[PDB]
Each structure stands twice: as structure tokens, then as C-alpha cells.
Write a protein that binds this ligand. Structure first.
Ligand SMILES: N#Cc1ccc(N2CCOCC2)cc1
Length: 209
């Protein structure tokens, strides 16, 4: 059972700008997604200080990077706080409505796409390199869900029947045909060292076989 939703208008406007603007510095998408994972990890870490049972769904706090050349996917997995159904349908869009608006006004006042994270909307940089993004997520207080969008103005949410995650978020980037460099081991390592060397959780690259 799949429900389809319209993006908030400002978010749809930003996603169309990201897909259609010539901008060669696409590697920042990985910094932005890792930063989002770090924020999610901070949140469950903080909550666990006063309620240790919040880690019953998994004590390890980490980020895994999983390239798959056969599927042309790059997957970013974290064991952070996860997202509820209300997060997926209402809350994140409400917050991104205002941040997207500000970011676009900034893009007219000298800013470039690389400052997107200062407006809290770094997630959408995924669409620099992905034609479709699937987000599998599990929050302690809700069931496991799959969110997905190929942009174009809409996204879907469904309960997820796949492998249970325990707790956290898995962002699956279905890469554009000309963006497969982000599946290469040495390219991912270079980007992580360049942009994400100070993240306070272990980032593990899964090597393909
Ligand atoms: N309008 C809206 C809206 C925008 C973004 C998202 N998400 C993006 C990140 O993954 C979680 C869900 C959901 C709804």
C-alpha cells in the first residue's frame, strides 16, 4: 500500500534547480548526507543519556558507505534516531519549506550550491548525482518505512517489508549514468577525507568483491 504526496512548492522548486543547473562540484552531496547522518546519531546519543533503553534497538553508533557497481547505487547507512511516519509526511517538509526558501534567496545574493547545508536542506544535494532516492528508516517509536522520490514534484511513503533495520536510516542513491565515479573506492575515500574527516562517528567503506 503506497501513498503519494506532493512536495511543498518551495522544495519542488529547489529540486528542479538542483537537477537542471550545470554545477560540476557534485561531490558535496556525500558531505551533506554524512552530516545528516551525524546529526541523527547525535540525537539518539543524547536521548540515550537519560534513557539507556533507547539503544535497545542497537548500541553501535556509526555510518556505513556501500557502493554497488552492479545496481549503480550508493547507499549511506546510519544507526541514528531514524524518522517516524509523521517525520516523512509532515515534519521534515514543514522545516524544509522555510530552509529551501532562504537558500534560494541566498543563491541570488552571491551564494553557490555548496553552502546548502547552512540552510538545513543539504539532503536535496543527493539529486546532483541521483535520479531517484530511496530512504528506508526506522524510529524507536514507529514501524519501518520506505520513502522515495524521483523528483518531478511528488514522493511516496509505504511501510517497508524488506530487511528490518533495528534503528536508523539508509539512503539509497540510484545514480545517474554519468555519475558512477562515486562508486569507486578511491573516489569515495578522497571525498570522505576531504569533507568529512572530523565527523565524530566511524565511517566505514564497504569494499565490493
Ligand atoms: N514536502 C516534503 C518532504 C521533503 C523531504 C522529505 N524527506 C527527505 C529526507 O528523507 C526523509 C523524507 C519528506 C517530505
Amino acid at each position: 500500500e503506497v501513498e503519494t504526496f506532493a512536495f511543498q512548492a518551495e522544495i519542488a522548486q529547489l529540486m528542479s534547480l538542483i537537477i537542471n543547473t550545470f554545477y560540476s562540484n557534485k561531490e558535496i552531496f556525500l558531505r551533506e548526507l554524512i552530516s545528516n547522518s551525524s546529526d541523527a546519531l547525535d540525537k539518539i546519543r543524547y536521548e540515550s543519556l537519560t534513557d539507556p533503553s533507547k539503544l535497545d534497538s542497537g548500541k553501535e553508533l556509526h555510518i556505513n558507505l556501500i557502493p554497488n557497481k552492479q545496481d549503480r547505487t550508493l547507499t549511506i547507512v546510519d544507526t541514528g534516531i531514524g524518522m517516524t511516519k509523521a517525520d516523512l509526511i509532515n515534519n521534515l517538509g514543514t522545516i524544509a519549506k522555510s530552509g529551501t526558501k532562504a537558500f534560494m534567496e541566498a543563491l541570488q545574493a552571491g551564494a553557490d550550491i555548496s553552502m546548502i547545508g547552512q540552510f538545513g536542506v543539504g539532503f536535496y544535494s543527493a539529486y546532483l548525482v541521483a535520479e531517484k532516492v530511496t530512504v528506508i528508516t526506522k524510529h524507536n517509536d514507529d514501524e519501518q518505512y520506505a520513502w522515495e522520490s524521483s523528483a518531478g514534484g511528488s514522493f511516496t511513503v509505504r511501510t517497508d517489508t524488506g530487511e528490518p533495520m533495528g534503528r536508523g536510516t539508509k539512503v539509497i542513491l540510484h545514480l545517474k549514468e554519468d555519475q558512477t565515479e562515486y562508486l569507486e573506492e578511491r573516489r569515495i575515500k578522497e571525498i570522505v577525507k576531504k569533507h568529512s574527516q572530523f565527523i565524530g562517528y566511524p565511517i566505514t567503506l564497504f569494499v565490493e568483491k
